[PDB]
Amino acid sequence: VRLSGEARKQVEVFRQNLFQEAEEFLYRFLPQKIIYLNQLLQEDSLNVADLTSLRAPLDIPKCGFLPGNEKVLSLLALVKPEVWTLKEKCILVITWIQHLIPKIEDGNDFGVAIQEKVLERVNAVKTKVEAFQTTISKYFSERGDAVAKASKETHVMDYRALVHERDEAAYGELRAMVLDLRAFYAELYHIISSNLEKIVNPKGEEKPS
């Protein structure tokens, strides 16, 4: 095809943007978010041994307001931006690696197959990250509908105990997500940096010609 020299620069500047974002993500964002989530694991909020005291029981009726768990809400505010930031930046890594696929050949695709296996592992993490985003919205849909169902049902009290399970399951997921997210940043650094040789240079270029 044919295109203007400015259109070449529009593509080149785009490739230069992904180069700086992918390199910064590997050598800056990854080591910073690993220790950041490691500090959140060391925070006394996630170190609580007794989960039964972390429940937020609500009255079951000019009715009074029915807030959620103050600790879970505050910890969801910490986990949520890490779920978005990790997901968004992995996508830039998925894009940057995908551009390194050369012209499709009929062989010597092992370096390309390595690139695919890296993308599949990132996609596997990306699905787990999206599952954490569902869990963040799960606590609001589950507890919200269950408390009002426990509000309209005064005969069956154990709905609130099911709401209490949503408290312990959330807090259990809160530390689990922060632990799993930190593991994800660690897996990304281990997969990308170690295989970076085959990611950037998938072909040995041994051609004798």
Next chain:
Amino acid sequence: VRLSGEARKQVEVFRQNLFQEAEEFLYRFLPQKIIYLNQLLQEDSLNVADLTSLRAPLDIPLPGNEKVLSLLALVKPEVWTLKEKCILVITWIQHLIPKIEDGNDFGVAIQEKVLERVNAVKTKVEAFQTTISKYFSERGDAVAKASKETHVMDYRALVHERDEAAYGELRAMVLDLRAFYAELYHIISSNLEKIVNPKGEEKPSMY
């Protein structure tokens, strides 16, 4: 064989007449429908992308939309007529399937792949008509629930979101139909040699 020797010649209706009638459909009906949709792509109702210009006036705290219906009057017979002719193509390939044998399965595998792509086109036009029925079900439930909602301006304004989506999808359907008409003739005519004659029968009798 101990079979009745009468009515067996009735297969020549679909193995010859409808068979040659489906032949005419390939190089005549299919391209006639390609240039036909090319006139339907000139409709400005599908070409407008503006939400407010596309959507009809809505009285809610009950008018309908006849502009999309006139577009449906063009789209609905096109997805259905294609679906009817695809059924003829399935039968047209069915009569060309040879008897059971070991070799010469290359042309048979072609008949299986082409017929499966005909089922794919049949699935697409079924999803088209299903979405067409969803225009009345979803929007019908949209303005019915919107009529009950007053202080909510969110769900009431979101009713027009599917109103714009109806126009953009119908134009995408017409574009897909023209691709379907082209792919039917292009795929069949390219493999026409092996589809009609999957077995050349040049094997010596060795008798």
Next chain:
Amino acid sequence: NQYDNDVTVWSPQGRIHQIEYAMEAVKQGSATVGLKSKTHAVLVALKRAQSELAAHQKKILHVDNHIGISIAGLTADARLLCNFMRQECLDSRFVFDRPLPVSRLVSLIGSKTQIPTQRYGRRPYGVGLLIAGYDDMGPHIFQTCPSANYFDCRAMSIGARSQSARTYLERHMSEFMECNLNELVKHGLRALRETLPAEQDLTTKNVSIGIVGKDLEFTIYDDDDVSPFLEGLEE
């Protein structure tokens, strides 16, 4: 998986499964036992009949005047290799005009089993051998493997349920040296008892032995001479 198809292909742990399947072929044969003293050597062979009306198979093969052997494994693989053992021993008396040293014969047995291993398409010989013989240095008990490994032995028991015999061979190993010909038969038949089931034990029909010695050439006994050998032996 894919690595058991032949001998040549090595497993990722560096093992050959076809050699393993050949070494497990020997354990599917009859159980025989043998022992030597400072003077004599006795090979006790267990004979098994294919059916009740069938006669007992011969597990003893005469090789040289001072040499004898018991076969455990595939029958025909022993036969082709027996034609090789006897040919080499006949070649010894054809060339050297002397009895072939039992250690030299077994070394030729291994060399014959090393040939099929390193080459593709050749199967190794799936028969095991317990061989005995007397020479200037006294009697010798040797054992061979389809893996081509061969060892020098005081006494051994091969076949199924051989450890109950080998445990017996460990406790009486001190006595095996100083006993005489009549006692070696008593210890040999009592060693065979441990490899045998709890129902059928000892009959002169299915039990045969052979003996080589200082001035005594290798001699095979079957029934008539074995009957007094079984007499006077508790189990």
Next chain:
Amino acid sequence: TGYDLSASTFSPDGRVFQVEYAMKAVENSSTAIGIRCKDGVVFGVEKLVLSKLYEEGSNKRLFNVDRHVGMAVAGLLADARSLADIAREEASNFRSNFGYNIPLKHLADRVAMYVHAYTLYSAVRPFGCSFMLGSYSVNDGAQLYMIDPSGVSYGYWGCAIGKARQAAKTEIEKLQMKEMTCRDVVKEVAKIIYIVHDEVKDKAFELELSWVGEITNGRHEIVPKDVREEAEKYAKESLK
């Protein structure tokens, strides 16, 4: 993947995994060591006792290729005795050709060349055994060479084959072996054998030692039982 099936088929990284797997089989073999000095070369091997039912002197791990050439093999015993006679045929054909004893460097080359010949063909299999070759002469002197399963020979002041090798090689580097005499070297060989073997997996063993040098008059000779027990007592001074 199918790339490691035959030795004739290269890996995607340009390697032969069939030769590698033959090397992994050597790592399961018992440990054997050797050391060369100005007086000669000292051999030692750990011979594991499999059962008490085996006669003394059975499963001899000290191989004699030629009058002045000793050998110690760690690996598959089947391929060991094969190459053993083949190495003797090369030394015998040498004498049948040039009328004297083949030098150790020339013998290690011909043997290693025949080891590498089976790595090329897919219709055969490479050797699963590795060994060391010592020699001594008045014109050459003490020499020690080791051949791997890939058929490559390297000159060594000392070497270790079998399971434990790198651990025994570092213990040899901690002290100068050149000025020592074979009488003092066998004291260190038995000392290393007791360090390598502990009771965890294996049960019992026997010390098989061999000497070549001035003490043996330049000829390959096994160590007698009298000196072997005395050499153990020197190692029993510290181990015990």
Next chain:
Amino acid sequence: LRVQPEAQAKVDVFREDLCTKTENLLGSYFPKKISELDAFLKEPALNEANLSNLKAPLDIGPVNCNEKIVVLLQRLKPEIKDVIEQLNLVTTWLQLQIPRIEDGNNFGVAVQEKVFELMTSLHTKLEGFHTQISKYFSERGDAVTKAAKQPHVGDYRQLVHELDEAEYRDIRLMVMEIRNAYAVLYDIILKNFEKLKKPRGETKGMI
């Protein structure tokens, strides 16, 4: 197991009954019904060019249906009930013609497996065709109820009018599909009959 010469012979009579039925199916039933549905499609009620007359007006009890569409449904349903049962006769016949399991002569055995699966696939399609007929019965009645549930939105009446079109459009398509259900049934069983009823075995060797 022991052999009972009486009861087992009656089982053989049952197999021979299905053989006689299959012969009557191929010789008479199949080719005559194919030409019958071909003239059934030529009926001008199925050729209707204007579906606006087919829209049933709803008074929004004064609730009716389109007599043309319902009668066309009542005309198609017995043809669907006939193709399903005659297919079950073929399905049982194909299974009873399969010999015992052996290693040799398995070429014709694998052929009988594929032909048998083709009839199970048709049986699933035939059940889905009659299900759509009963599906539109519940969907149209509920759509009219939704029109009376909210006597304002006109999309519900347009939905019923679209369902009236969806019914009639599917009628003409199913008539072609049931006619193909006969043609594909007749073609496959006619193409495996003559020497393919007993494709292998009964040869072995002279000695």
Next chain:
Amino acid sequence: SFSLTTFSPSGKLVQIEYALAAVAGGAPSVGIKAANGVVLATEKKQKSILYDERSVHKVEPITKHIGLVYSGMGPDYRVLVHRARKLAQQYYLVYQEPIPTAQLVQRVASVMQEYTQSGGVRPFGVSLLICGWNEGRPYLFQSDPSGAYFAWKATAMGKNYVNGKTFLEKRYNEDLELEDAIHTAILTLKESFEGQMTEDNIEVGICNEAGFRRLTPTEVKDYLAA
């Protein structure tokens, strides 16, 4: 020992099909038969200055009156070189005369056939273009790995060979002197070749009444002046 080349379900040979696709992407090579001589101009490209141009030459003579060029694999060509030259030897052994080009190409193309049948061996990856001079009539032949040899007045081979054939179809006709045959072979070579054109980048040779001879870089530079 089993044949690696078998018939496809369509009847074509699968192995030789990739052989023809291999020579299609080789080094661009063109030739022209005009008047009393045949011009052979090929492409020798070196990746670096360290490469010595006098060590390796792509244009090689078969004999005095015959010469050959190639587009395809390097190693398979030298095998063709030794066997074709030995075939000309064994020719001169029996017949004691210079070999005709028709008989030379015939029995050499038969060697390409032998490996489409014999097992454990791949077909040749080289498409040979043969030039010859016999009895005053010039010869230009074209052979591919399939073993079928043809005859052409002018043709092209290697990368973008379709363009070189169409260009000579338009430009080239009869009544062209050897001097015009060189300058026409250069023009069709300027189209397929990209970049600056020097005497080292192109290797040219001709065959005439005096036999097949390779052009020196000095006289090639004279033809680079247009």
Next chain:
Amino acid sequence: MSRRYDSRTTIFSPEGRLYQVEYAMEAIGHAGTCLGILANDGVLLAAERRNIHKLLDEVFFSEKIYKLNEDMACSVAGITSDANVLTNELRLIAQRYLLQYQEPIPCEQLVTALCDIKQAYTQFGGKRPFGVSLLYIGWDKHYGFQLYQSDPSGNYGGWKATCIGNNSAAAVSMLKQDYKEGEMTLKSALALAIKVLNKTMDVSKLSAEKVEIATLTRENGKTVIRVLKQKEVEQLIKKHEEEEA
């Protein structure tokens, strides 16, 4: 030696057929049209030319037509590679006949001799079969003018008229109509072959270069084989042109 690389070409199909043999005839089915006619006063063998280019030489003789010996000749349809060996082997076989029997080979002996070689390669050896089908013409002292047809499977049979390659069934259908057994001579068969060649060939503008015609007849006790010059074929084109329109 690896048994994974062996396709085992001797495997029979469940219907008792050979795959490599059936794939050979399919490759022959794509070859150009070649026909021959047995006539009273001579034999006629004509064929088309599929390769057409302005830069072609063709300074040789015919393309698919070869000469087996003085009294015989053949045509070719198939892979030109396997055709060269068969043409060599046929000439070797026909010459080895001249060794022992020192007489012109009967047209029946030369056919069954090559076919025994074709079936030997399909029987064993592991080598692929041959992809060439051959027609044979000539004269012998016993049966006279002869026309034969060969298949790559080794099967052969006598024919008064036949066709191989492209448009074979179309020419055979016309041979069942116009051909008169024991009536039309070599002269009438020449005009008939040109008629069949023009109608069965969908490519228009038949020229003396695009087609080839060869005749073999016995005159005054000597077998006369010749290939009609392009001008002589052009004269026949002028004759058929008037006949056609």
Next chain:
Amino acid sequence: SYDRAITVFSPDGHLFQVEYAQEAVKKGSTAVGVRGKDIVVLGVEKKSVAKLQDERTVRKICALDDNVCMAFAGLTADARIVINRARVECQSHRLTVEDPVTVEYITRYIASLKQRYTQSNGRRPFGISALIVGFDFDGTPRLYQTDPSGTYHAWKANAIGRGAKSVREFLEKNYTDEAIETDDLTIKLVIKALLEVVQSGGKNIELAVMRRDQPLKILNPEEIEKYVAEIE
């Protein structure tokens, strides 16, 4: 060279190779022969089309000797190898023995080739089955059929090709001591056996007969129509 085992055992002991070879035998043309008193009659259908193919090269009725002829059904290529190699060995027998070749002595050699080449390394099993019929000393006829597996057997009446079992059903029921009693009965019975497999048959049916020490004679098509003329 090419050396490997072609025919190999299966879990059931049957040989897929040999079985597929017999399938090609079943798809061959129908050929039949019947032992008379002093005569034997061979016949085969011919599938000639449009007077095009010559009738000289089609003949499937071959003679191994003056007293021994044969007919085959199967691959026509494999038959030409067996017939030639059988004639080479049959006359090599007359080199070893002045007396002629008994039909049983050539049959054992022929079937032995199908034994060797089936189990031989790299070779292929034959796809043909042929009827070797001839006259032993004293004029006693013999009829033998081979098998691609290598077995052979004696038959008073036998048939091969497609519908070979159907022809045997005719032979099994209609062959008695009354059958093949004279010349007129032997000729009619062989024709009547082929009359069932007649499909557009006419002149296409080919027949041959050998009588005592007389050589194999081919009965011309005109007398075929005369013997088929009497069906009552």
Next chain:
Amino acid sequence: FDRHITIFSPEGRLYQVEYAFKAINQGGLTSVAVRGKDCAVIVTQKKVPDKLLDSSTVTHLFKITENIGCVMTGMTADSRSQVQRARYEAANWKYKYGYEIPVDMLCKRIADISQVYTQNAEMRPLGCCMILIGIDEEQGPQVYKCDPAGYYCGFKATAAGVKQTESTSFLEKKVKKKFDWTFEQTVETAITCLSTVLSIDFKPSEIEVGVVTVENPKFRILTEAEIDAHLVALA
């Protein structure tokens, strides 16, 4: 299929030949040779990982004949195997053609050996590439390199091993500026080439340097004392 034996890929390539290229970098060494005016110099790294390893027995510089030097980059097992055959071919030249084989005709026969491995699926190619030097009496010094594929060409300087493009990049600095090539000044570029890419500054005991000159046509390896004299002076 195409990736197991040597046969044409879908694009017409050979993957077994490409893996033979990838087998060169598996050696873990880097060598360089520069063709000078009157001289030819090879510089390679001498690796002695073990203290017990004898340095005199580990040499990467090989002698094909008097006037021809050699260095091997690739699999060590394949390297020493080709050199033995290279000496078999070099001696076959003199036994046939009468004179010392030139470096061009020597690389040709060695390349033809790799051609047989490529075309035939029976034998695998060698994973070593040979770099040969020498001085021809007509054209002067001759330095060539042969890859396992069989391609060889005249090189003003050679590069092999882990460092290839970077080694050539430094060699491009010298040839483009047209530097004067003498015995010392070629050793100046050769040591600097390998030192800057690996960031080492090789010691005399860490490397071995073969040299050949017009005045000294016999190939000889420089002594550590001379290498040190060519080190400090070159520093």
